[PDB]
Design a protein around this ligand. Structure first.
Ligand SMILES: *[C@@H]1O[C@H](CO)[C@@H](O)[C@H](O)[C@H]1NC(C)=O
Ligand SMILES: *[C@@H]1O[C@H](CO)[C@@H](O)[C@H](O)[C@H]1NC(C)=O
Ligand SMILES: *[C@@H]1O[C@H](CO)[C@@H](O)[C@H](O)[C@H]1NC(C)=O
Ligand SMILES: *[C@@H]1O[C@H](CO)[C@@H](O)[C@H](O)[C@H]1NC(C)=O
Ligand SMILES: *[C@@H]1O[C@H](CO)[C@@H](O)[C@H](O)[C@H]1NC(C)=O
Ligand SMILES: *[C@@H]1O[C@H](CO)[C@@H](O)[C@H](O)[C@H]1NC(C)=O
Ligand SMILES: *[C@@H]1O[C@H](CO)[C@@H](O)[C@H](O)[C@H]1NC(C)=O
Lengths: 322, 183, 195, 48
């Protein structure tokens, strides 16, 4: 807010602040642009399809196991256990100390329908393959939908079926090491835990400038109005007015640079979900280390987590060529 | 005005305990939230109320002139108590007792009724509720329609192959440059 | 249909329209701080020099010339943010015209919705507009599928496509168009037994 | 032909020369801005 932050409960600043012109209309317009850009980013990252697909009742998937990633019906929330581990590690009661005009607006998409979008993308990427992002959805069984991901790598599809059971438990146990690796180290969500910290540090330190003197005799306005007369109080308070508006401008400029960074990350995330989920990208070291087969998206607090099911050769052997 | 302190908050009872010499309470973010009454040494509590943004949910000017005033975050069991002269800086003192209100997560909106259909969103509001203009013309509020729940006939033996195609021409628009300006 | 589509709604050219309104409204806001008081006695320059002390007038004009320069300093900072945003799209536009136009891109959902065929560039004021000719399927039918086949005690895998049964006789067809053919050794390759 | 292509003309490696010069006169102007009075008596702090 313009007047509430700088000269809250001060009517006599109203003629003193509005004479500066249309300065903070630009500030409100910039923050409204950031606020609608966040909703635009959330809309264009997740909502790649408009039909909300549903999982089948029976959960047999050709010998594989996807129990951890599909939503659990036993919980009151329609989330998966991986979101249950991901939600507790992200930390922040911190909004009650924001009585100085800093009102955190809620997102347009609430936290439940984002999980519905991720469930729809998962139900697309297991039952339909890649064809549901390029027209009408064509359902396909999973032991044959995997057989057309080796064929875009360089190995023919004669190794998936005849080694089906051996590739089943090798994948399912590969899920299990994800369960404790997030809780093994605190740096696993370090790409997100800093981000909520970046608004934790900046919003807190925005408060301490109005607690500071800023070259004036007092940080509060009532006592300098009391003991010293208004005919020479404007020369005392112009420093505080200019310093507070300069600090607000600096905070908004840092917010614009951070929002440009988040925009550059969000376009990349949209590209990743556009080709590492809805197809099979041929670019090396783009959808995980090594050869890339498919990926699964997972929701996160103010972010996203990709599970790239990559491919790595091993146990080389020497031979003589011509 | 307690012992030379300035503030215009409410005075309630808090469960926090002071030391016999520690007189004035504080918090992390350097705010005044607790004082001691000289006459009686009971523990007090200070918090201000209330402030928030005001939005005008309106259709186009040529369509109609009716409004839907929104109140951001404020619990509206409080604003009909606050119907008083020299208390409401917005001019409409009679609007606090108006049409039927509907309570959202971001605060209730006054001037629009609620419907429980699944319609597309025209004017987004927040937290899964938004408004539109519908027919007897009034502003409504409803829940997001994320599309029809399309089913998948998945099995372990079923392929789906198209037999036809439609070539379409989709148009996308990208900026390239900007008006050059020298000062 | 495009010539009716581009004039039916104003949202078709809203992106280039928003580009020219941000640069227009930046200068409309910019001139308005020239009449701003900035806590001084006047906005006209000669009123300060009319009656005040000339050492005090230079102090008075110091707080006014810094206020006018800070409005210009804010403006240069705001254009630098906007110049980096367009450059992120201009390098995307050069990426589009060097892949979608001068070739066929196998990136899914990059050069158009669905499978992409070619494109056309057109010139617009302060930008570019494309005509992404794509290829999108239509009405479909569902069949019964087996992952393999075995005839002489030996499994056979398709050379391309997938086996499709209509109910009585099997067929092999392409993966993105219904085109059934009879099963032939030219259409399949053998790998191991069928157990 | 690469060595004669880059070694003869000096415009081959300008894309790093402007990078190492963008952080060269920025520092020089930052030093030079101490000379400005900023509406004060003098540009040095000890004598006032
Ligand atoms: C999947 O794994 C879980 C434990 O990881 C197990 O309880 C469940 O029965 C498995 N489902 C199938 C279909 O094998
Ligand atoms: C191949 O042979 C060379 C020389 O005998 C040896 O150095 C190298 O380690 C061998 N490679 C592997 C994979 O064993
Ligand atoms: C103030 O006076 C009242 C009335 O006698 C008394 O009850 C109260 O305890 C006094 N408080 C102090 C701090 O003296
Ligand atoms: C308003 O206060 C009542 C008091 O119990 C509470 O039930 C309600 O949830 C509150 N609403 C909001 C929006 O805070
Ligand atoms: C494909 O669609 C076009 C468009 O109407 C139609 O004319 C044509 O007959 C269709 N072909 C088939 C095989 O259905
Ligand atoms: C084809 O799909 C429809 C619904 O999508 C289903 O009712 C029908 O049984 C399917 N056909 C076969 C042969 O399974
Ligand atoms: C399958 O196609 C063959 C060849 O056209 C035909 O002879 C046969 O009757 C068809 N069967 C069914 C069930 O449609």
């Amino acid at each position: 807010d313009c007047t509430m932050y700088i000269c809250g409960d001060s009517t006599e600043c109203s003629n003193l602040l509005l004479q500066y012109g249309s300065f903070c209309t630009q500030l409100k317009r910039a923050l409204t642009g950031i606020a609608v850009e966040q909703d635009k980013n959330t809309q264009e990252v997740f909502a790649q399809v408009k039909q909300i697909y549903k999982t089948p009742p029976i959960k047999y998937f050709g010998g594989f196991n996807f129990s951890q990633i599909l939503p659990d019906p036993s919980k009151p929330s329609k989330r998966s256990p991986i979101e249950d581990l991901l939600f507790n590690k992200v930390t922040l009661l911190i909004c009650a100390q924001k009585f100085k005009g800093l009102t955190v607006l809620p997102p347009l998409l609430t936290d439940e329908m984002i999980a519905q979008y991720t469930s729809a993308l998962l139900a697309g990427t297991i039952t339909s393959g890649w064809t549901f992002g390029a027209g009408p959805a064509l359902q396909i069984p999973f032991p044959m939908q995997m057989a057309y991901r080796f064929n875009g790598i360089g190995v023919t599809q004669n190794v998936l079926y005849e080694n089906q059971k051996l590739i089943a438990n090798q994948f399912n146990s590969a899920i299990g090491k994800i369960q404790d690796s997030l809780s093994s180290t605190p740096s696993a969500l370090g790409k997100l835990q800093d981000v909520v910290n970046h608004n934790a540090q900046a919003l807190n330190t925005l408060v301490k400038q109005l607690s500071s003197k800023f070259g004036a005799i007092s940080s509060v306005l009532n006592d300098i109005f009391s003991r010293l007369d208004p005919p020479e109080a404007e020369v005392q308070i112009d420093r505080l007015i200019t310093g507070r508006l300069q600090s607000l401008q600096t905070y908004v400029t840092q917010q614009l640079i951070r929002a440009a960074e988040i925009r550059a990350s969000a376009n990349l995330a949209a590209t990743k979900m556009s080709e590492c989920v809805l197809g099979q990208s041929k670019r090396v070291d783009f959808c995980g280390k090594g050869y890339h087969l498919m990926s699964f998206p997972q929701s996160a607090p103010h972010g996203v987590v990709f599970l790239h099911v990559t491919y790595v050769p091993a146990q080389e052997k020497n031979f003589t060529t011509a | 005005n307690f012992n030379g302190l300035k503030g215009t908050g409410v005075l309630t009872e808090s469960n926090k305990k002071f030391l016999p010499f520690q007189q004035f309470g504080r918090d992390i973010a350097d705010t005044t939230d607790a004082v001691r009454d000289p006459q009686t040494l009971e523990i007090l509590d200070i918090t201000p109320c209330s402030f928030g943004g005001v939005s005008v949910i309106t259709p186009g000017t040529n369509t109609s002139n009716q409004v839907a005033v929104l109140y951001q975050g404020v619990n509206c069991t409080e604003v009909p108590v606050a119907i008083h002269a020299d208390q409401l800086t917005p001019t409409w003192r009679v609007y606090s007792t108006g049409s039927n209100v509907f309570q959202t997560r971001a605060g209730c909106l006054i001037g629009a009724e609620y419907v429980n259909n699944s319609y597309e969103c025209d004017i987004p509001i927040g937290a899964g509720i938004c408004a539109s203009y519908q027919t007897s013309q009034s502003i409504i509020a409803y829940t997001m329609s994320l599309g029809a729940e399309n089913s998948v006939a998945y099995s372990n033996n079923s392929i789906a192959i198209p037999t036809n195609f439609t070539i379409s021409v989709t148009t996308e628009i990208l900026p390239v440059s900007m008006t050059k300006t020298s000062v | 249909k495009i010539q009716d589509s581009l004039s039916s709604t104003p949202s078709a050219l809203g992106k280039l329209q928003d580009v020219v309104n941000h640069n227009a409204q930046a200068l409309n806001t910019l001139v308005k701080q020239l009449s701003s008081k900035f806590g001084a006695i006047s906005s006209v320059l000669n009123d300060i020099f009319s009656r005040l002390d000339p050492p005090e007038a230079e102090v008075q004009i110091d707080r006014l010339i810094t206020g006018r320069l800070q409005s210009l300093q804010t403006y240069v900072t705001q254009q630098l943010i906007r110049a980096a945003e367009i450059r992120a799209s201009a390098n995307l536009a050069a990426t589009k015209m060097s892949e979608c136009v001068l070739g066929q891109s196998k990136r899914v959902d990059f050069c158009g919705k669905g499978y992409h065929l070619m494109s056309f560039p057109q010139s617009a004021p302060h930008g570019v507009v494309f005509l992404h000719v794509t290829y999108v399927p239509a009405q479909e039918k569902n069949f019964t599928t087996a992952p393999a086949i075995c005839h002489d005690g030996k499994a056979h895998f398709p050379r391309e496509g997938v086996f499709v049964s209509n109910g009585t006789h099997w067929f092999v067809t392409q993966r993105n168009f219904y085109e059934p053919q009879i099963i032939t050794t030219d259409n399949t390759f053998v790998s191991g037994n069928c157990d």
